[PDB]
Structure 1
């Protein structure tokens, strides 16, 4: 998943290649890199249909398992959410419609939302299509766990602002929140 930034004479290209993983079978490795780059390209493009800002895709190639997209000269969400709490509200915004159209970013966090001029959702390396409420709930759980393990000091306010933005843009937030409470407690007896 290495990224190389090049300045084409009219294109600001970033080539992201999915390096093979030695610990995995080369058969399954090739299969999963191919399917993953395909899904990432397709979903990161389809999210533009939502109005949700995302990097532009200049080209893809499954055989070479690479995606060369529009590079953004910004900083990570975590490096800026500490000094700016509004991007949690913006994350709620751009996740509300994303969940509304029933496409799930099963890797939601506060580390892959670049802030250069706006909030760019630069990674659907595990995007999926599903109407299942359980998948949405576990995606919310993953995001909450990530924000916990990253900014425990402000988790409460960060999650509250994120939920405010999400309920501002998404309307069925109550049922997914109650499923979040019902599932996050599934530890033991």
Structure 2
């Protein structure tokens, strides 16, 4: 079993070496290329040498499984996110549709602030994000790592077609506190990355509150989490 497992991991390494590395986080490298004729991204949860190898294998597997489950949940719930093509548990690689020609919300906001020199034209974007994340929370899906880089705008850009990505830290919870923390994390990332765009986040919160069926306890928990930190 060890020989066959080793051969499969070597196959995976060979395949990745033919792809373009496009992103790297703390825990995953994202590669892009073709998979059986379709534009694809392959996410490899890669081990760090200084951690215990048994723990690293468990962690890589857990985050691969959780992202695959989240993406299936999204698709069946009508939440736009990449579809999953293939999950390789020998290598902790997740093969996914590429969101071709897309731009991060982060880049879109920053470009707008640079050119328009004002956030007034981003309220529509904020309202869309509010509707999308309200739908996600109403499916009891906690993203776990919300930033404006984990939301993509699919072309044509001005249609505001938001695609959610990178669910490795996601989990299922109905608890308003968990949803409040999800929003609090987004808020801190948003305000620190996009200074002086508070009206945008205000419009996001208004739309989330209108769009979600159970936002009242969530937004109260958001206030509590903010105060505690």
- More displaced 10-residue stretch of structure 1: 32-41 or 131-140: 131-140
Task: Return the TM-score normalized by structure 2.
Answer: 0.76
Output aligned runs, 1:104-183, within 5 Å.
104-117=142-155, 118-154=161-197, 156-183=198-225
Q: Which runs of 5+ in 1 are unaligned?
A: none
Partners of 1:62 and 1:90 in 2: how far apart?
A: 35
Q: How far off its partner does 1:172 sit?
A: 2.2
Name the structure 1 match of 2:69.
Answer: 42
Mapped pair 1:103 → 2:131: no
Deviations for 1:120-158, whole angstroms, at most 9, x for unmatched residues?
Answer: 10111111011222211111111111111111211x212
- CA RMSD after TM alignment: 1.6
- How far did 1:9 drift? 5.8
> CA 1:8–1:38 in structure 2 vs 1: closer, same or farther (change >3 Å)?
closer
- Structure scoring higher RCO (CA < 8 A, sep ≥ 6) equals 1
1:63 and 2:90 matched: yes
1:44-70: per-residue Cα shift (whole Å, max 9, x none)? Answer: 121112211111111111221001111
How many residue pairs align between the two structures? 186
Q: Which residue in the other structure is 2:46 paired with?
A: 19
Deviation at 1:166, TM superposition (A): 1.0
